[PDB]
Symmetry: C2
Subunit: 116 residues, 2 copies
């Protein structure tokens, strides 16, 4: 079993630039074969979904197509970073990050603040 950890305070980003949201499982372990999903909150929509070792472009909301990447230089340690390219004003708000290992899952919620 593991808990999912994200930043406790708002992540700041400049509109037009890139924003990065960190998320990891603890205790850390290889999360390469896990499902990692990012969603908006409170009103849900798929930001990015990674499962079966690949990013699932067809499953994310149209607005995120080609604008997201799940960086994995440290996924073997249980850490991932969602990168939002060309941050939009509407990207401001809540996000939920999930890590799912078969029948078990946990998640963390976090806030993104967009500045003009």
């Amino acid at each position: 079993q593991f808990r999912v950890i994200g930043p406790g305070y708002p992540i700041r980003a400049l509109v037009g630039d890139e924003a990065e949201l960190p998320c990891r499982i603890s205790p850390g372990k290889n999360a390469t074969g896990m499902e990692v999903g990012w969603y908006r909150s409170p009103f849900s929509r798929v930001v990015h979904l990674y499962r079966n070792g690949k990013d699932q472009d067809a499953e994310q909301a149209p607005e995120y197509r080609g604008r997201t990447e799940l960086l994995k230089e440290t996924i073997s340690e249980g850490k991932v970073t969602l990168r939002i390219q060309n941050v939009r004003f509407s990207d401001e708000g809540g996000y939920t990050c999930f890590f799912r290992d078969h029948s078990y899952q946990e998640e963390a919620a976090m806030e993104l603040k967009v500045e003009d």
Copy 2:
């Protein structure tokens, strides 16, 4: 500014019984005049919404009507507890708790495990 804290590991509950999900802001302060919202995740739906000093029954999803209470014996310390009456199998899964103070908000995500 404050961060929102919830349990890191799954909260267990027996189907048919009551389940309780804790959530608080830190540093703690009186949250009586804040908006507190609970939602399901990843697929969103309003579990319970408290704002302007009152529980907003009309805003929660039909399935939660009359089945939820936001306990406030310690809301003055920044803590609240969502009580789900007559827990259902479908209540299993993710939940997101928000605390909103005017233009500022933060949240925490947590998991509920329902046993038969």
